[PDB]
Structure 1
Amino acid sequence: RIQETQAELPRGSIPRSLEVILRAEAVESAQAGDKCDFTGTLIVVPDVSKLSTPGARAETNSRVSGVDGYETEGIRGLRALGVRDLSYRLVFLACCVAPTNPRFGGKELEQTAESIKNQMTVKEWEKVFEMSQDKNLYHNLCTSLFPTIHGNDEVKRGVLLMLFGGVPKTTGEGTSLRGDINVCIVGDPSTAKSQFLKHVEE
C-alpha cells in the first residue's frame, strides 16, 4: 500500500492510498516509509462490495425464460441468467520500482563501506573523499546543515553527532550496548527547538 506524497495534497484533503502489485523481480523493492517511483499500469480489479444500491451488472444475452415451477425469478432467476455485479476498484500493477530521490546515481542493490562506495559514481566519491579529507569538516557540516539558524552552535554539533552515531556492540553475556546517541533540546519559547527537529526531519 502506498499513499499520496505530502506535496501532492489538495486543500482540506486526506492523502489518497492505492495498493500496488509487485511481481516477479520487483517483489521486495519498496519498504514501508520509502519514497518510491512506481512504473507500470493502472488496472481495475473486480472487488466484492455493494449495498450502496444495486448497480451495474452482467447477464447473459440469451433470452431464456423459466417454465412454470422454474420461473426465472428471485435467486434462482439471478443464478440462471448468470447475473453478477460489475463492481471494480483501481489498483496499480508495477513492473518496476525505483526510489524517487536516489541517493547515489550509480546503482542500488549487504551494505558494507565498499558496497556503498561502489554504489556511487566517480564524481560522487570524489566529493565524499574530498569532504572526508576536509579539515574543518565539523564546522562545515554544522553550517551547511543549519544555515538559517543563528547561534546555538553546541546544539548543531550535538545533532550532527547524533546523525553520525556511535558503534553498537554485543557483550559475550548477551548484553546489547547502545550505539547511537539521543539528544533532547529543552528551552524557552521560540528558541528554535522545533526548527532543529524540522531541519533533521527534512
Structure 2
Amino acid sequence: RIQETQAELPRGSIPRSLEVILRAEAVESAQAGDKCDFTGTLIVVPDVSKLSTPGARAETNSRVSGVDGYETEGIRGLRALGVRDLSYRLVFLACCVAPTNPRFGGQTAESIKNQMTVKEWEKVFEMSQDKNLYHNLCTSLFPTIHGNDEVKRGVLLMLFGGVPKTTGEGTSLRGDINVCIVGDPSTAKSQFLKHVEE
C-alpha cells in the first residue's frame, strides 16, 4: 500500500492511497515509509464491492428463456443468464521499483564505499579529512539558526549516534543518544525538530 506524497496533495484533501503489485524479483524492494518510484502499468482488478445500488452487469447474449416451472426469473434467472456485476478498482502492477532520490549513484563500510560513486567517495573522503568538519557540519545542517551552537552540536551527535552493545548476560547497552530541548516560547525548538526531520 502506497499513498500520495506530501507535495502532490491538493488543498484540503487526504493523500490518495493505492496498492501496487510487485511480481518476481521486485517482491521485497519497497519497504514501509520509504519514498519510492514505481514503474509499471495501471490495471483494474475485479472486486466484489458492497454497492447497495445496481450498476454494470455482464450477461450472455444467447436469447434463452425459461419454460413454465423453470421461469428464468429471480435468483434462478440470474444464475441461468450468468449475470455478474462488473465492479473494478484501480491497482498498479509495478514492473520495477527504485528509490525516488537515491543516496548513491552506484551494509558494511566497504559495501557502502562500493555503492558510492567515485566522485561521491572522493567528496566523502575530503570531508572526513577536513579538519573543522564539526563546525562545518553544524553550519550546513542549521545555517538559518543563529546561536545555539551547543544545541546544533548535540543534534549532530544525535544524528551520528554511538555504538550499541549487548553484554555477555544479554543486557542491551543503548548506543543511540536522545536529546530534549526545553525553552521559552519561540526559541527554535520546533525549528530544530523540523530541520532534523527534513
TM-score normalised by length of structure 2 = 0.99
Aligned residue for 2:93, secondary structure, equals strand
Aligned residue for 1:25, secondary structure, equals coil
Q: CA deviation at 1:98?
A: 0.2
How many angstroms apart in 1 are the aligned matches of 2:151 and 2:87?
Answer: 56
How many angstroms apart in 2 are the aligned matches of 1:88 and 1:51?
Answer: 12
Number of equivalent positions: 198
How many angstroms apart in 1 are the aligned matches of 2:71 and 2:189?
Answer: 76
Aligned residue for 1:129, secondary structure, equals helix
How many angstroms apart in 1 are the aligned matches of 2:85 and 2:143?
Answer: 59
Cα shift readout 1:98-119 (whole Å, capped 9, x = no counterpart): 000000011xxxx000000000
Q: CA deviation at 1:185?
A: 0.2
Aligned residue for 1:8, secondary structure, equals coil
Q: CA deviation at 1:52?
A: 3.4
| Partner in structure 2 of residue 189 of structure 1 | 185
Q: CA deviation at 1:59?
A: 0.1
Q: CA deviation at 1:51?
A: 2.8
Q: CA deviation at 1:138?
A: 0.1
Q: CA deviation at 1:43?
A: 0.1
Aligned residue for 1:34, secondary structure, equals coil
How many angstroms apart in 1 are the aligned matches of 2:52 and 2:137?
Answer: 58
How many angstroms apart in 1 are the aligned matches of 2:52 and 2:188?
Answer: 51
Quote the RMSD (CA, aligned, Å): 0.5
Aligned residue for 1:186, secondary structure, equals coil
Q: CA deviation at 1:50?
A: 3.0
Greater than 4 Å deviation, 4+ residue runs = none
How many angstroms apart in 2 are the aligned matches of 1:120 and 1:176?
Answer: 32
Cα shift readout 1:30-71 (whole Å, capped 9, x = no counterpart): 000000000000000000013330000000000000000000
Q: CA deviation at 1:77?
A: 0.2
Report percent identity of matched pairs.
100
Q: CA deviation at 1:142?
A: 0.1
Cα shift readout 1:149-177 (whole Å, capped 9, x = no counterpart): 00000000000000000001010001000
1:58 aligns with 2:54: no
Q: CA deviation at 1:132?
A: 0.3
Q: Which of 130, 141, 147 is the matching residue for 2:143?
A: 147
How many angstroms apart in 1 are the aligned matches of 2:41 and 2:10?
Answer: 24
| Partner in structure 2 of residue 165 of structure 1 | 161
How many angstroms apart in 2 are the aligned matches of 1:99 and 1:78?
Answer: 49
Aligned residue for 2:7, secondary structure, equals helix
Cα shift readout 1:60-91 (whole Å, capped 9, x = no counterpart): 00000000000000000000000000000000
How many angstroms apart in 2 are the aligned matches of 1:102 and 1:113?
Answer: 18
Aligned residue for 2:78, secondary structure, equals helix
Q: Which of 161, 177, 200 is the matching residue for 2:196?
A: 200
Q: CA deviation at 1:126?
A: 0.2
How many angstroms apart in 2 are the aligned matches of 1:52 and 1:162?
Answer: 54
Cα shift readout 1:104-143 (whole Å, capped 9, x = no counterpart): 011xxxx000000000100000000000001000000000
How many angstroms apart in 2 are the aligned matches of 1:145 and 1:69?
Answer: 82
| Partner in structure 2 of residue 35 of structure 1 | 35
How many angstroms apart in 2 are the aligned matches of 1:17 and 1:105?
Answer: 29
